[PDB]
C-alpha cells in the first residue's frame, strides 16, 4: 500500500533483514551512567512479541516490528547512524538492544528489545554494521 503522505518523492525502503521471533520492553529510563542496562528494567518481562523486519532507504535504516500472524506494524524506528540513539547496546551483551520508535502521531518512544536467540540479536547488530560500513565517510 501507498504511504499516508505522498508528493512523488523517493519514499522507498529496501529490505535488509528478517527474524522469526522478537520481544520488546517499554523501558522507564533514558540515560544512566553506563547506557540503559537491561538488568535495570525488564530483561525477562516483555510487553509485546512478534516478528522483526529491517529495511533501508539509503543511509537510513528502519527497524520495523511485525505481528507474528499477519505481518501488521507494531512500531518503526528510523536510524541514520550506528551506534546511535535509534539503536544502542544496553551496556554490552548484544543479546539485547534499545531503539527509538515513532508512536505514529508526530512523537517518539524508547523500547528495549530481547531476542529468541543470542545469535539472532548479534545478527540484528551485523545487519546494521554492514549497512553503516559503506557510509559514515568510511
Amino acid at each position: 500500500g501507498s504511504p499516508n503522505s505522498m508528493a512523488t518523492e523517493l519514499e522507498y525502503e529496501s529490505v535488509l533483514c528478517v527474524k522469526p521471533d522478537v520481544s520488546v520492553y517499554r523501558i522507564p529510563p533514558r540515560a544512566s551512567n553506563r547506557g540503559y542496562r537491561a538488568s535495570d528494567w525488564k530483561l525477562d518481562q516483555p510487553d509485546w512479541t512478534g516478528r522483526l523486519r529491517i529495511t533501508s532507504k539509503g543511509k537510513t535504516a528502519y527497524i520495523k516490528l511485525e505481528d507474528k500472524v499477519s505481518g501488521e506494524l507494531f512500531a518503526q524506528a528510523p536510524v541514520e547512524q550506528y551506534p546511535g540513539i535509534a539503536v544502542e547496546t544496553v551496556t554490552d551483551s548484544s543479546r539485547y538492544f534499545v531503539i527509538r520508535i515513532q508512536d505514529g502521531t508526530g512523537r517518539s518512544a524508547f523500547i528495549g528489545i530481547g531476542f529468541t536467540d543470542r545469535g539472532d540479536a548479534f545478527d540484528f547488530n551485523v545487519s546494521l554494521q554492514d549497512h553503516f560500513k559503506w557510509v559514515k565517510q568510511e
Binding site: R34, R37, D44, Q45, V90, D92, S93, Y96, F122
Partner: peptide, 15 residues
C-alpha cells in the same frame, strides 16, 4: 520473575 540473564560487561563480547 521468569529468569535472570543479565547483560554481559565483565568480558564485554559478541559470540
Amino acid at each position: 520473575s521468569q529468569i535472570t540473564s543479565q547483560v554481559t560487561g565483565q568480558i564485554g563480547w559478541r559470540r
